[PDB]
Design an enzyme around this catalytic site. Structure first.
Site, PDB file in Angstrom:
ATOM      1  CG  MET C  72      -1.718  -0.949   1.343  1.00 15.49           C
ATOM      2  SD  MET C  72      -3.123  -0.994   2.830  1.00 15.49           S
ATOM      3  CE  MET C  72      -1.460  -0.410   4.041  1.00 15.49           C
ATOM      4  NE  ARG C  73       7.446   3.909  -1.364  1.00  9.05           N
ATOM      5  CZ  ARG C  73       8.019   4.626  -2.321  1.00  9.05           C
ATOM      6  NH1 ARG C  73       7.418   4.536  -3.500  1.00  9.05           N
ATOM      7  NH2 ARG C  73       9.003   5.584  -1.956  1.00  9.05           N
TER       8      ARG C  73
END
Ligand SMILES: CC1=C(C(=O)O)N2C(=O)[C@@H](NC(=O)CCC[C@@H](N)C(=O)O)[C@H]2SC1
Ligand SMILES: CC1=C(C(=O)O)N2C(=O)[C@@H](NC(=O)CCC[C@@H](N)C(=O)O)[C@H]2SC1
Ligand SMILES: CC1=C(C(=O)O)N2C(=O)[C@@H](NC(=O)CCC[C@@H](N)C(=O)O)[C@H]2SC1
Ligand SMILES: [Fe+2]
Ligand SMILES: [Fe+2]
Ligand SMILES: [Fe+2]
Lengths: 256, 256, 256
Positions: C72-73
């Protein structure tokens, strides 16, 4: 089998019960300790005093002893409530608090160092850099008011006015008069080359004193691997800091 | 869509099904593997033998194969129970244990290296320092007896006598005869510059073999950032150790 | 007591309400912010657009904007769903997405930097290496679609179309028109030498913007210890990287 001895510190220092102590260290990694400068009285005195503060201390004065980041390293934390202390940067409501708590801290720090000194002596351990520099370290005291882990301390002292694994069963650890409960931690195992067990334990007030190593405590990487430490460390020696990183971690779960 | 192929290792090494393999790697990051020196038999032999030890091994001899810190890196752990192994510092009840388990370990380590070698070949990847030094690494085998994560391994091999995300759905991964299940891990993604997916998975005995990189596995920081790694690393190259720290971490959750 | 002010950024920059701002910083470490280039409109525009993608984007095009490791970057993550962004290596479905979201990101990054600049000014703080190099940093934006923590950011901005600790009670933080919610994080406390509180908070869509320091943000170890940071850091200065390690960690729980 599943019993937990009491040792008298005084007797260990005289060189009594040395085989029994070594055998407790290696097989159980926990014991009760007497004759170590702790009573049972003084607990009361620090307990009642901080408990009054928890119960009757004003929200405004709780603020003056609350760190700006909620780490539970020094002063007050509300989640149940905690009061924490170490050797420096304390936060004391004071009047007399600082007096009673500086004393309660110091006696626990003395007792922790002196029992660790006997763990090292009993196991024939000389830490890299010497015993004294190892024990002049970074303790943390937490007192709280209202899942199994092992400790990453040298020893942890727990005073009572709790369950642990002994011989493959999780057992109760009732109070024994004028004795403190000692859990050996993973730094004891590490520093001694595996001669000391770090038992699992957990709950089911509380006073917990962690005798934690300095950031620069240095140890042998291959010997760590041998004792069961799953290190990702290049090269032949390392520090506490290298192993655990740049923030203290006090306890650990067995991997799920 | 949501299917999982079997590849024969032997065919991959001959250069067959190379587009299909690359496409599985990039889109799914999991597959079954045959023709890799593993049977189904030998599992039985290691399983029954350690299971007898779990069931009928004496508490006294469990002690002799229990590490003094409860890390599940080598030997026995009781929580359900585990037996762990790697290339060195093992704890074997022995007589014949060491024989059956050294063999079961070695064949899994051979199979893991040879499939990783094909992942690297298929993706045109030459790790910093070479393929061989990358694969001569730090494996960990865990066998256990009675929340979605990805693995931080190169590959993880899982033998069966389980669910994963494929195409946006968490699917079951039933047994296939004489095939082992392979999950690619985050080191595969990292080393290949993003050409390999690290799928999430979880449960719902077990044998899990992690092919973990050495502490000094070195990679490009900007290329890591590009693949989605949220690194806090100053400068242009880093190690495994720099990234994950000084203790192996085998699995990771997506941030909550 | 348990109230949360709104400040206008514009007024803070003019030097108004400076005692009130300093006092909010030290005692609460959270506030609403207006007049910072954010509306309420533009939220809508980015929200509806990504929400359409969540609802009506094809699984095939979700794949093209999914990182190969599920951190989830950047891009899309399915667990509920997330869309993440920073200053570089973004994954945009595009046509017009990149336009609306690059704008929504940039205005939030401007607002975050400008309010952090006022936190530093209000507290008389000059970070090691200067204010500008401190604020030219590593932000992370997460937008999601359907246990108390503090943030390890400088500030975190949260837009609304949530509860926090204020004065010893966990309170609700309702919407205020054309205002954004700001939580100060642990880097604010650290950089200012303790002049800023890092409050605990938690839930009960979402847009969260973390203004995170560079890996090489450097600070004083003794001053960190003084503010309550339980550092295991040898020597007198350290970096963000030294403290937190080689992967960003965005939030932290108070030790259990
Ligand atoms: C294949 C597989 C499975 C599985 O359940 O099947 N998952 C498991 O059961 C897990 N295997 C483990 O022992 C994970 C614990 C490692 C953890 N203490 C850490 O250090 O980070 C994973 S690893 C891959
Ligand atoms: C504002 C806010 C809220 C919130 O719920 O509103 N909290 C959230 O929902 C959180 N935002 C996140 O994605 C936290 C996950 C980061 C975690 N994987 C780590 O690396 O440490 C926090 S961060 C601040
Ligand atoms: C003696 C004892 C007990 C106990 O419950 O009695 N356990 C406790 O209650 C624990 N004492 C703590 O505050 C643990 C939290 C440290 C954790 N935030 C970390 O940084 O890793 C342990 S430490 C030893
Ligand atoms: Fe403990
Ligand atoms: Fe896994
Ligand atoms: Fe937060």
């Amino acid at each position: 089998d599943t019993t937990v001895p009491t040792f008298s510190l005084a007797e260990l220092q005289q060189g009594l019960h040395q085989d029994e102590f070594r055998r407790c260290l290696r097989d159980k990694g926990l014991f009760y300790l007497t004759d170590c400068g702790l009573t049972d009285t003084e607990l009361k005195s620090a307990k009642d005093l901080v408990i009054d503060f928890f119960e009757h201390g004003s929200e405004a004065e709780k603020r003056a002893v609350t760190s700006p980041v909620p780490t539970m390293r020094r002063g007050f934390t509300g989640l149940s409530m905690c009061y924490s202390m170490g050797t420096a940067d304390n936060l004391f409501p004071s009047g007399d608090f600082e007096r009673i708590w500086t004393q309660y801290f110091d006696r626990q720090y003395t007792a922790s160092r002196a029992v660790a000194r006997e763990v090292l002596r009993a196991t024939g351990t000389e830490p890299d850099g010497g015993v004294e520099a190892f024990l002049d370290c970074e303790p943390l005291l937490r007192f709280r008011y209202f899942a199994p882990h092992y400790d990453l301390s040298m020893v942890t002292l727990i005073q009572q006015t709790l369950q642990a694994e002994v011989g493959g069963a999780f057992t109760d650890l009732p109070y024994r008069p004028d004795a403190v409960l000692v859990f050996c931690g993973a730094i004891a195992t590490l520093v001694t080359g595996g001669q000391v067990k770090a038992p699992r334990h957990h709950v089911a007030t509380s006073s917990v004193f962690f005798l934690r190593p300095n950031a620069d405590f240095t140890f042998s990487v291959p010997l760590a691997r041998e004792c069961g430490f799953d290190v990702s460390l290049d090269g032949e020696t390392a520090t506490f800091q290298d192993w655990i990183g740049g923030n203290y971690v006090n306890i650990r779960r067995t991997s799920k």
